[PDB]
């Protein structure tokens with residue numbers, strides 16, 4: 262209510278909306294000047310444009326939310342902690358603890374005594390404060406085994422129910438995850454896929470939507486461009502409104518306004534291609550100790566689809582979205598052809 | 600009085616008029632059964648009272664203290680009259696009840712249950728040890744050196760051997776009667792809970808004939824009567840007066856029964 266806009270802003274908003282360049286402009290305009298791996302932020306906009314609402318006031322069934330989770334993982338040299346401390350300075354409901362930042366109990370049920378009432382109290386959590394928001398997470402593979410069977414509850418039921426000697430609780434909490442895991446080494450080992458490298462099960466590894474692989478640019482050539490441009494960045498100490506026109510705050514309402522007045526819907530579009538090619542897509546019986554395609558993908562796919570149809574504000578589903586969705590998937594779904 | 604005498608007299612015309620078990624009714628002989636063994640813990644059946652005279656359910660709650668006292672006078676004036684040699688060992692009596700048509704679970708009793716007949720059970724936890732008490736008011740005058748005489752409330756009359764004088768006083772550590780004492784903490788069983796929460800509890804007092812009978816971690820059955828601590832410092836208050844609750848013990852039944860136990864039919 263305290264952010265309802267005037268109709269004059271709709272001019273500039275839909276003016277940005279009217280061009281296919283918008284898919285790339287905001288992906289370019291998140292970072293201050295970081296002009297590498299822009300192939301990924303174009304998917305992060307699908308969480309910034311925080312998903313779809315196929316509401317469940319209909320029958321009470323199945324609670325299939327537009328559940329979006331996507332993660333990054335690679336070396337510590339890439340600016341994951343830095344980028345995400347900046348993303349803390351982007352997202353409204355910004356939380357930022359991290360792997361071995363606080364335990365499961367360190368994330369839920371901060372139950373303890375208070376001298377204000379001077380009495381013992383059933384008390385707070387951390388995740389549930391960020392309902393529908395985000396929590397940037399770092400250095401994931403340091404957390405205790407008690408934790409990380411908590412997130413199974415949320416990621417796969419999107420709920421929480423708590424019971425201690427005091428209260429038994431059935432609260433509400435749901436949100437989208439971001440996190441920036443790291444391995445037990447400095448570098449991901451080649452000839453050792455992520456299927457075993459990082460510390461997780463045989464098929465719960467791939468159980469996230471898609472982990473957009475990241476690694477240091479293994480190339481000396483790129484070093485000069487940033488070592489020059491991003492030091493001149495400091496050396497001049499101000500910015501310039503080049504072709505990718507940075508709007509000071511008018512960009513931010515295209516994010517803001519576009520959660521509320523939209524309801525993506527499917528006519529005939531984003532079903533039929535894999536419904537056709539399912540034979541060769543589902544010959545996945547072959548493999549020695551592998552992981553591959555399963556009949557859950559299209560849930561996540563319809564999610565990503567109606568997400569990218571939200572951008573451009575297509576109230577009916579987008580058909581182009583399917584193409585870059587397939588691109589998104591097969592960008593990293595045979596990183597283990599081996 | 601006319602009617603207010605009839606209570607003991609109906610007990611007298613009860614314990615040799617009401618009969619079961621094909622003659623030679625128990626309480627004709629249960630009382631001497633107990634005076635033999637020097638126990639002084641005679642026990643009453645309520646169902647037998649309903650079989651003989653049902654009057655004794657409405658006459659009771661208006662002050663069951665007085666009901667129990669008018670009970671014990673009868674056991675005295677029976678036993679110590681018919682066994683006059685007896686007046687050596689204890690010289691005091693009271694009675695017990697073990698038949699009540701109701702088991703009131705915990706977390707069920709309120710101000711409506713005040714100062715009247717009860718049944719409840721649960722489990723013991725930590726409580727005190729074994730301590731004696733006082734029983735009688737007797738002082739020692741300190742001006743004139745006499746004793747004021749024999750007399751939760753103080754008395755202190757002006758009448759005394761010291762020319763009904765000597766407001767001051769002092770006290771000896773003897774020639775006054777004493778009384779054993781013990782406390783308990785009654786908690787409810789972890790079976791019949793509201794399925795996973797904290798439990799509730801009350802404190803209970805038991806008295807001298809009933810001690811070194813209970814134990815930590817035990818099963819329980821008690822008649823009890825609901826107390827009222829008369830003042831936990833009434834004054835400028837909290838959001839509540841600081842008031843409290845106990846039940847006073849009349850008669851226990853244990854549920855384990857780890858002794859040679861059952862009373863005996865005639866045949």
Ligand SMILES: Nc1ncnc2c1ncn2[C@@H]1O[C@H](COP(=O)(O)OP(=O)(O)O)[C@@H](O)[C@H]1O
Pocket residue numbers: 295297336337338339340341342343344399
């Ligand atoms: N492409 C890049 N753009 C910007 N900074 C980069 C880039 N690659 C490496 N860096 C460096 O990485 C650092 C931030 O890394 P950080 O995310 O804090 O590591 P970690 O998350 O492992 O703690 C910055 O100081 C920056 O100099």
